[PDB]
Amino acid sequence: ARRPARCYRYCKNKPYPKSRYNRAVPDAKIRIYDLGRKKATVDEFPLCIHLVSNELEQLSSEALEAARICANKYITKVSGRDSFHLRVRVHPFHVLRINKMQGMRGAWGKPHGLAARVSIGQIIMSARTKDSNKDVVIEGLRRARYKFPGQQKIIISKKWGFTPLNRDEYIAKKTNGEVIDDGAYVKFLSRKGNLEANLQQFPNYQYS
Amino acid sequence: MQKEFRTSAYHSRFQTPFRRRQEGKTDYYQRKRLVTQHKAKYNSPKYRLVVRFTNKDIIAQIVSAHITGDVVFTAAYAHELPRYGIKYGLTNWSAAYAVGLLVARRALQKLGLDETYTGVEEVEGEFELTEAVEDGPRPFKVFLDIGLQRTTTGARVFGVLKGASDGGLYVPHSPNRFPGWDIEAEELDAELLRKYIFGGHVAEYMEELLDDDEEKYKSIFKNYIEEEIESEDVEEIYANAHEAIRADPSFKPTEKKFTKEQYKAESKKYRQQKLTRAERQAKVAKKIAEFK
């Protein structure tokens, strides 16, 4: 059925997504991208840990599913299912083709599988958790790394959870009333637009 | 339940029409067809007879188009008519004829084609085009620009058409839009057209209304009543005016009770001025503070 992944490791072709031009494409093996306590608020999980690509490469949907399962299983076994929120940050949108499934005549292949095209420094998996749960989550990602080809780095983020703010700028914007909850994420205050709506949405805004 | 339509993406991708199309004033299709000149007649302009009707005024202008904007050659307005002896009904079909005749005579005076190309001096309502004189300059050619106004047989724009044609301008046209055109029998009843040229329809309304509804006659034809103008002497008001229009078609501007500077100073008092950046910043700060 599946060829060894070495046959599809490199981004040799242009991106080949599902479209009105290729329609009989199978589904990706990965369907779930958010695991753990995905409904946790931003303040509950300050620590973010990334699995980062050191490769310009293609990762199959099968590898994404396997690594996701490995990390989830380990972290829920060691720290509990609600101690983290794991997010897979790459979606397989590139269709691989297979030819054999005469000779080189009419050799345009059929859809065979799906792969995500990742760059160098691209984040593959993100895990927001508490600080005390660092060594577990790292070990959860370090195992998931075995399911991937190429080199990946485990990098502890400078930022608060999945927010774009550092762990210090977030605290500054939080004690200043510029951050409100939005479920699992937050909304930040804007100094543009309707003044009354801005003031109503952020009542604790200590204006300067 | 339904999607809000006026999104920021709707405004971002919106292509506003031309400024004067969004005002609903210029038909740029027709304007392109009117203005564009044969490229081998290099800088020779096409001249338009712009005819516009307001609720109180008739505006007739002779215009040539340029890149920086249209340039007026001459202009005759209906409120100039009281100088020539027509004081009421400044939007008649006959007032349209008088304005067309006035603008034609004024333009020909400006050019110097007065003695040549006099026009139809004895208005009998016959269809006629200004024919060139052999061994002489061709008549001033002008094209009618009725703008957004609908083309109907009997419309007032073709009154200015007929007046300008009779005034000596060469304006290409056909007689099938004049009042008195029989569409079934494709000939022009020049008697009814001559009636319309000298206010015959208005005079007949005066006569027909006076003996049937005197109270409405008193309100509709007030100015005629206090001017002691009956139906039978309506025609002369136009008939003399034509002659007077031909006697001195030169433009006399209204003497201005105030100078340009006085007008500007008076008007500037009633014009709100934009707030300075600091003023609106202070307003925002105050509104924030009063929110606590």
Add this chain to the structure above:
Amino acid sequence: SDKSQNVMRELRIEKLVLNICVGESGDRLTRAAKVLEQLSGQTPVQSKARYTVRTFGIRRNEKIAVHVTVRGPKAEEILERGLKVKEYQLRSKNFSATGNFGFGIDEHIDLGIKYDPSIGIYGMDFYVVMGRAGARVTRRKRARSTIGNSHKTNKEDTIQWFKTRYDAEVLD
């Protein structure tokens, strides 16, 4: 300025539209057109089906309905003649957000015209388009524009005007 009690803000009927959507074409539609021409005194116009529906028994471009537009005093007279059948009692859910209202009679002989067995009885649809002075702005060719918010007709103003001018009830 900007006075709500201005003379030109007066509500008044723009047009009354009488609709009979007989589902078929032929004798019944012709007699419905005769009924409309009798009531309004004007030649009505026949509407064609926009598309084919087997359930309703209509096909595209088949002449289905007939309608007529009346304006002025005649519209007012027909409107009060139809309100008599409604015994001067409309509902709060008869007035649109744009300030228009309508009702539907079920027999056209209740209006007060002679009954003929050959014609039969047709139901009828009444719709009144409300508007102040200056609506020509939205309908003229040159310099056509929109009407300002304060000058717009809405549901509450139309309901109050209907209650005042007819001493009728709007059943909320």
Add this chain to the structure above:
Amino acid sequence: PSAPSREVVKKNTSSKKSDAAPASADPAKAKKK
């Protein structure tokens, strides 16, 4: 009598069923049961 007809303003040349006419989008007309 004269017979004027309402003119066509739409551009849908196709002679087919129109948009948003699906079954099961309607409420229960017999909900009072």
Add this chain to the structure above:
Amino acid sequence: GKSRGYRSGTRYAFQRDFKKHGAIPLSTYLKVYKVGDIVDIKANGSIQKGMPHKYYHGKTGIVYNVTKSSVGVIINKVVGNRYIEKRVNLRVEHVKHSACRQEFLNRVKSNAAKKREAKANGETVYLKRQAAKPRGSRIISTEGNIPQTLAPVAYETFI
């Protein structure tokens, strides 16, 4: 199967500009072209009559003929080892005066003005354009501007 029709490959070249579709502003129809004028060619997709072929889109040439609604433009096209003179009939919607004429025609006037004044003053003036020359010597004052020392920064990760 290959397709090599007249307008093949012009999907983006003949498109109107974003938020610039519709009617042509009439300064396009008020411009005056004389034989010998230099004009740029840019096909307007909304006027399909008198449209240039895609080769001439973006080319500049000499007007040789003026007709009712069009100009004839001379283009030199490489065909193998030489140039061939091409004569393209273009409606004026696809044509614009080349802005390189108005700059050079101004330098001609400026040179004429400078030359006549120098004769009046009995001196000389040089009218040839010059390329940018290396800059001369100079002294940099450090009052309020004492040199600030920079160093390469250490490596950090910002994710």
Add this chain to the structure above:
RNA sequence: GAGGUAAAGCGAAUGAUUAGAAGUCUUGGGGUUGAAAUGACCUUAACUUAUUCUCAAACUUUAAAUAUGUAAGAAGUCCUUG
């Protein structure tokens, strides 16, 4: 002058796409109210709103580098008038 490839974008159009949150169901069902009132409630699913993760050879507002058209005068410019 021309261009729409690299890059970029997707809280910008088209198409694809992960997750919650707040609202409306009046034009979704189940259960529980209701003796019956479609008039509430618990729920999932729908949509709507402001967000969120990720994409496009046959998507795109933007948009390179390289390559490419023309010009840099005497067959030119100006003045007068055939």
Add this chain to the structure above:
RNA sequence: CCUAAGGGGGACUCAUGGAGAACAGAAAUCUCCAGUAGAACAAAAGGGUAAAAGUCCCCUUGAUUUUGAUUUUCAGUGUGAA
């Protein structure tokens, strides 16, 4: 494939959504509001088009005659098309 689905002129605005009107309901017809085109333009796809190139109406045969020039494919030959 089309005597119009060619040509000219005029009038109108489309897809769709919301709120309303007897039977009438998710879909018949009427009314208003919103509506940058999300419609339509014979047929592939792309481009183009809003007081129009779309829809409807009126008049028509320029889909005519003569023979040259030019663009594309190009040998700068033919044919087709413009």
Add this chain to the structure above:
RNA sequence: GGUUGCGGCCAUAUCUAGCAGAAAGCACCGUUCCCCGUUCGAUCAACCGUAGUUAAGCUGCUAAGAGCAAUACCGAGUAGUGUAGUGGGAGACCAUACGCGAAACUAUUGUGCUGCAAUCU
């Protein structure tokens, strides 16, 4: 300076919600004998300028407004890229040398200018 007619560029001009508008203009507005067009004098045509009104249109102003426009010790000399090496690396790719050099983002500012003619407290 206001206003009208005709415009050029075609949102710094558009959109939403409010407020104000002297003079003139424009506008709404009144009528149906006549030319004309409609199911409907609503649109279109004509007549009066007479009976009324700034309510709307229009114009201007307001908004930590949406959009749009411009700018930049904003991001970023980043991404990309022309040229080079018997450079690194198993490879994928990467660094360096001589050049060119974005977009998003961020911040700030602005919100029609103007030609001809006529007219006006």
